[PDB]
Every structure is written in structure tokens, then in C-alpha cells.
Design a protein around this nucleic acid. Structure first.
Ligand SMILES: Nc1ncnc2c1ncn2[C@@H]1O[C@H](CSCC[C@H](N)C(=O)O)[C@@H](O)[C@H]1O
Length: 327
DNA sequence: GATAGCGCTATC
DNA sequence: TGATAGCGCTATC
């Protein structure tokens, strides 16, 4: 994550829904905001959240009374994506894990925060011909908020990961917020290699399969993209090896394959999957963040989390706009 | 719970 | 296309 001298969000309170690892909390708190409520129903996510914020989030949101939620100025929510990801069945709102957005909508109608900050995967924008993103837009417009939606790629904001995500920013209409903008991309000066751990600490992640077929020459120079060097098995998800010299592929929560959830990488002549800590780095988490003791649970948590750095630039810009009020 | 083979969709 | 990539799916122990 990035350092922030000017706390655009000082004095503002926020709710952390679908909290997971608390990526949103890290982002807003770095901007001066104050978390007043958090919600995450996964037992393991809860322990990590606690292991890092002292509190345990509240359970199943679909059964929490909105009227119970503390007053807040900014609602944060990176809701479920299984029902919309390019990697899933795309059942959308027909999938039980796909209606969570309306739970948010219910919270907003009740608490009417000054801003609504949401996040989800890229395929969300075009899912079902774009009708899902429209329901969200209208639903928010109908709640009387503006709808700023855009897809950003992490690799464009200082993080070496080809993770493309859609960010939806909504300001309550009564506030004439009209200068909001998404962060301008900037050249990438960091790559996978720069965030790796010493060999001695990842020796155990090294894999060596007879079906390892190297199909491409390691690259000399650093590029701001993913470069496939080889493959294992049929080359399906988690069986593709990339160059640490380029940027990392999109971490996942339920992914399988020998290099499950992180993908394979070529380091000093060896093929291995990323270490939980490296995933953290790949996601923008500060090394001072304590990861869950279960490596599998830890990869899953980072897998469906968010890139702190990106969140920061958006949060800082959210503050900027909210703060511009000339006479 | 942890592990890992997969198989289809979206993109240009 | 044809090649690449995806906060995924789910069977098995
Ligand atoms: N009914 C429900 N109540 C609370 N959390 C729920 C939920 N259904 C799904 N979730 C949670 O939705 C989260 C989506 S992933 C969001 C990750 C988060 N922004 C981060 O930075 O870590 C998951 O952690 C999942 O456990």
C-alpha cells in the first residue's frame, strides 16, 4: 500500500461490508476515515480480521437489520463475484451468492450514507449483456445517488498484477459532487521479482513435475504484463507458469490446479507457486499485516480480496471531491 | 478442510 | 480466428 500524508477522509465514518481481510479498512483508515462497523460471515476471514483489527465482524448480512447498522458516511462493499466472474457459471442474480447487492441496496435505503463504494470483478460490467450493471445503476439512481463506474487494472497503479476490477462510486445526489474522477494510470516501476521472498523461505513451494513443458524463453527485460513461460499438465488454471520478470496473474479464491490460487512462476531456475506473504505483496498489503495460519485459507482470503493501493487512490479522490466546497 | 484436474467463457 | 487468461467448479480422501 501507499503512504498518505493528506487525510482526505479525516472525520468521516465508514462501514466495512463483506470485509474479508479488511482491504477496504486499510484503504480508508490510511485516509483518515474511521471504521464504525464491519461484516463478514466466514469464520476464517473473521479470525484474520480480528487477528488484525481486534474486532470480529458480524455474521450473515442477509439477516442483519439495516436499522442496526451504525450511521456512516461511506459504505464500502466488495461483494461476491462467483455468480459473475468470467471463471464461473455466470448465473448472476439467479445464483444464491449473487443477490447480495440488494442487501447493500437495503442498507443504503436505510442509512443513506454520503457515499457508496463498491467493487467486483471485470466480467461484472458486461455480465448478461450489461443488464446486471444496469440494474445496479438504476437501483442506485433510484435510491437517489449518482453512479460512477469504471474498470481499472492493478498494473496501472503501481501493483504488478494483471487484476482488472470494476469500481462503482456513488455520491448522494443532494451533495453536488461533480468533480469526482478515477485515478490516472501511471507507469509501472515494479514487477513480481521485486516482491518475492528469499529462496530459503519458499523452498517448500517448489514443485517439479515431469510434465513440466517449458514453451517460452525467460525474458531479460521487465514488462508491465504477464508473460507465460511454460505449462504443466493440460495447462488449465493453476497449471501455467509465468515470468517473475513480468507481472503476476489474477490471484483467485477457489482456484485449483497444482499452482492453485496463485499460478506458477519461474524463480532461479525453479517452478513454484507464490507464498501467502507474496500474495499479500501482490495485493498491496503491508508486511505488517498478519495472514491467517491456514495457508489454504490464507490464499483464498487474498484470492478474493482487493488491491489496497488501488483502493487508496480511489478513496483519496473520494475525499478530495467531498472536500471541495467553495463559497 | 485441503488438494488439484478441469472446461468453458470473454477478448481482440 | 487462435492464443491466453479467469475474486471459479467440484470430486475425492
Ligand atoms: N451473507 C454474507 N454475509 C457476510 N459476508 C458474506 C456473505 N456472503 C458472502 N460474504 C463474504 O463476501 C466476501 C467477498 S470478498 C470481499 C473481500 C474484501 N473486500 C477484502 O478486501 O478482503 C467474502 O469474504 C465472503 O465470505
Amino acid at each position: 500500500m501507499i503512504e498518505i500524508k493528506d487525510k482526505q477522509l479525516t472525520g468521516l465514518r465508514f462501514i466495512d461490508l463483506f470485509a474479508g481481510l479488511g482491504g477496504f479498512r486499510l484503504a480508508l483508515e490510511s485516509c483518515g476515515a474511521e471504521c464504525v462497523y464491519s461484516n463478514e460471515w466466514d469464520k476464517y476471514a473473521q479470525e484474520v480480521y480480528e487477528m488484525n483489527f481486534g474486532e470480529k465482524p458480524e455474521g450473515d448480512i442477509t439477516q442483519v437489520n439495516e436499522k442496526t447498522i451504525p450511521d456512516h458516511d461511506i459504505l464500502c462493499a466488495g461483494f461476491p463475484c462467483q455468480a459473475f466472474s468470467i471463471s464461473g457459471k455466470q448465473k448472476g442474480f439467479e445464483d444464491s451468492r449473487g443477490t447480495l447487492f440488494f442487501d447493500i441496496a437495503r442498507i443504503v435505503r436505510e442509512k443513506k450514507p454520503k457515499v457508496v463504494f463498491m467493487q467486483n470483478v471485470k466480467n461484472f460490467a458486461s455480465h448478461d449483456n450489461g443488464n446486471t450493471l444496469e440494474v445496479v445503476k438504476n437501483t442506485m439512481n433510484e435510491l437517489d445517488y449518482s453512479f460512477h463506474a469504471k474498470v481499472l487494472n492493478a498494473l496501472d497503479y503501481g501493483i504488478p498484477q494483471k487484476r482488472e476490477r470494476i469500481y462503482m462510486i456513488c455520491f448522494r445526489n443532494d451533495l453536488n459532487i461533480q468533480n469526482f474522477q478515477f485515478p490516472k494510470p501511471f507507469e509501472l516501476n515494479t514487477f513480481v521479482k521485486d516482491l518475492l521472498l528469499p529462496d530459503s523461505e519458499v523452498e517448500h513451494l517448489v514443485i517439479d513435475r515431469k510434465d513440466l513443458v517449458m514453451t517460452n524463453q525467460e525474458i531479460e527485460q521487465t514488462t508491465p504484463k504477464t508473460v507465460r513461460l511454460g505449462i504443466v499438465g493440460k495447462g488449465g488454471q493453476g497449471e501455467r507458469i509465468y515470468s517473475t520478470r513480468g507481472i503476476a496473474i489474477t490471484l483467485s479464491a477457489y482456484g485449483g490446479g497444482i499452482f492453485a490460487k496463485t499460478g506458477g512462476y519461474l524463480v532461479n531456475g525453479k517452478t513454484r507457486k507464490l507464498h501467502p506473504r507474496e500474495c499479500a505483496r501482490v495485493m498491496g498489503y503491508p508486511d505488517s499485516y498478519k495472514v491467517h495460519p491456514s495457508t489454504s485459507q490464507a490464499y483464498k482470503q487474498f484470492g478474493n480480496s482487493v488491491v489496497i493501493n488501488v483502493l487508496q487512490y480511489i478513496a483519496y479522490n473520494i475525499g478530495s471531491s467531498l472536500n471541495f466546497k467553495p463559497y
